[PDB]
Design a protein around this ligand. Structure first.
Ligand SMILES: *[C@H](O)[C@H](C[C@@H]1CCNC1=O)NC(=O)[C@H](CC(C)C)NC(=O)[C@@H](NC(=O)OCc1ccccc1)C(C)C
Ligand SMILES: *[C@H](O)[C@H](C[C@@H]1CCNC1=O)NC(=O)[C@H](CC(C)C)NC(=O)[C@@H](NC(=O)OCc1ccccc1)C(C)C
Lengths: 306, 306
């Protein structure tokens, strides 16, 4: 037993990380088949970033202005193009470590693993959630741009995030692998509002089911509630409204534990109204919302990948 | 910026995981050069585990009783031996993916990454700490035994933990890679006491320095204290006593932030005496002790590996 915030094994993604240099700026790229993907602001000087005309800036660049380095293997760039906020550098060599992969645009509330990288070399791996306001709460320094977020289904890597920027909150924003930002953000150094975040209710419930599976059951109360009744409590506390789609998603956990979803909701409602009274759940003094129902099920059934 | 519990990239370790079967029992092994390492209780039936005579049980086994499977690559066993609580199976093939590696016995309070595995295939990666009472708080199911904990120094993997068992607390116990248990535990299905745990004071301070580096400074108070004065508060709250060795280890963080260690101690003392008053630090409502000073420094300087 036990419950931990667990990332996917990162080996398949490690084999795809490269270093991309244009001028003095160096960031990370993702090398898949014969294409390297990276944030387009690799082409900017520090001054360009205040208000870059990326088309005009890219026109001044040629294939040989982009240095792509894979460890010490070094790639010849034979084509470049800009797709939304990413550059696609065509290289003369297919990555021999390319895994089976897909590009996906994830939904708010979903989770993924981030492989944090600098100069094209992995530093660490951690799990997180796409917030309802399309930010993530990551750990990113200068040079981390181009680091990617991903999920694994057995042998297939689904890439879902590429890091671009940090917002005036310490929160992080980026794009999918077609270069479209999650949320309203643009790749410019100018003040930008994230907007109000909300707590991912279905993930909190999943985590309460995790707790029960692992022996933590003090919060299991006596009451029940209704969807509307619970949803009134939800928006008081800036939780996303629960839907029948969410109830259905929680079905397997409900069947494993014998606790109806609406009964679990009544426990959550009391936790929101009364706090935790200095107690903890699964080692936490806060209600955790960065585990999806699938995350809980994979961790309590031992799903593997390779 | 931002601060996350970050594991090491696991690719180098993924390449070493194998499946070991003896009779009906299947667990994970670590394949390095031409030796596979795994918990010796792979040789036990469910009934043997109540009080196994491992020498007597191992005598009934021959090389061909051990099935070692690496993905679908399958290894010929040409020798076996028991070292403390691990078996060493000699195989006829050196692992072509063997990284530069070392076997280390870590100290309580240190951290390492765990690659959780089932049937020889990685499921997830997460960071944790060797508690002062030589347990870890992991996430481990049936079949996870033989999963390993490790640290990376650039290209060298230092293996420090192999998982063996779960204790009547939901906590986990295991050995180093020479098969010596951390703590007083034995590999027998019989009730076993872990003993009182304590909070790792130097790690809490490191995490408070992390917080200041990342803008969380509300807890920075006005007071100072002394080592003895703080150490009296420490043992009231079952924190390890702080030593001058710990003060020196915190030197670089003290120099980066301009906060004397004893000033930070005075903040910690007030947090222990008064609680957090419903506030959070780095997204947590509890004082976190599973980041070492080195962990903080690597995450706030961007150290990479390959
Ligand atoms: C690329 O690796 C780099 C990663 C960030 C450095 C520190 N943390 C990070 O995640 N990203 C950048 O340098 C971007 C480049 C832009 C997109 C052209 N810049 C930023 O992330 C800045 N943030 C920003 O401009 O957001 C708007 C803003 C916020 C606050 C105040 C003014 C503007 C960041 C370095 C401030
Ligand atoms: C091997 O993969 C397995 C992993 C554990 C299964 C569930 N969680 C795990 O980490 N380990 C075992 O099956 C060991 C085998 C022993 C060492 C021969 N057994 C256990 O971990 C049991 N724990 C145990 O015997 O500890 C003492 C005890 C505790 C509580 C009550 C009675 C005895 C565990 C399966 C209870």
């Amino acid at each position: 037993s036990g419950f931990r915030k667990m990332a996917f094994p990162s080996g398949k993604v490690e084999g795809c990380m490269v270093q991309v240099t244009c001028g003095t700026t160096t960031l990370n790229g993702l090398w898949l088949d014969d294409v390297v993907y990276c944030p387009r602001h690799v082409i900017c000087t520090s001054e360009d970033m205040l208000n870059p005309n990326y088309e005009d800036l890219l026109i001044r660049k040629s294939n040989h202005n982009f240095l792509v380095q894979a460890g010490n293997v070094q790639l010849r760039v034979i084509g470049h193009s800009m797709q939304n906020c990413v550059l696609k550098l065509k290289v003369d060599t297919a990555n021999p470590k390319t895994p089976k992969y897909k590009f996906v645009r994830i939904q708010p509330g979903q989770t993924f693993s981030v492989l944090a990288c600098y100069n094209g070399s992995p530093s660490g791996v951690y799990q997180c959630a796409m917030r309802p306001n399309f930010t993530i709460k990551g750990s990113f320094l200068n040079g981390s741009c181009g680091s990617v977020g991903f999920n694994i289904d057995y042998d297939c890597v689904s890439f879902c995030y590429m890091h671009h920027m940090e917002l005036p909150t310490g929160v992080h924003a980026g794009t999918d692998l077609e270069g479209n930002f999650y949320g309203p953000f643009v790749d410019r150094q100018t003040a930008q509002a994230a907007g109000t975040d909300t707590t991912i209710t279905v993930n909190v419930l999943a985590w309460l089911y995790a707790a029960v599976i692992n022996g933590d059951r003090w919060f299991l109360n006596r009451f029940t509630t209704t969807l509307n009744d619970f949803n009134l409590v939800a928006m008081k506390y800036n939780y996303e409204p629960l839907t029948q789609d969410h109830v259905d998603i929680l079905g397997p956990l409900s069947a494993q534990t014998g606790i109806a979803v609406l009964d679990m909701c009544a426990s959550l409602k009391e936790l929101l109204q009364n706090g935790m009274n200095g107690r903890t759940i699964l080692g936490s003094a806060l209600l955790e919302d960065e585990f999806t129902p699938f995350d809980v099920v994979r961790q309590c059934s031992g799903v593997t990948f390779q």
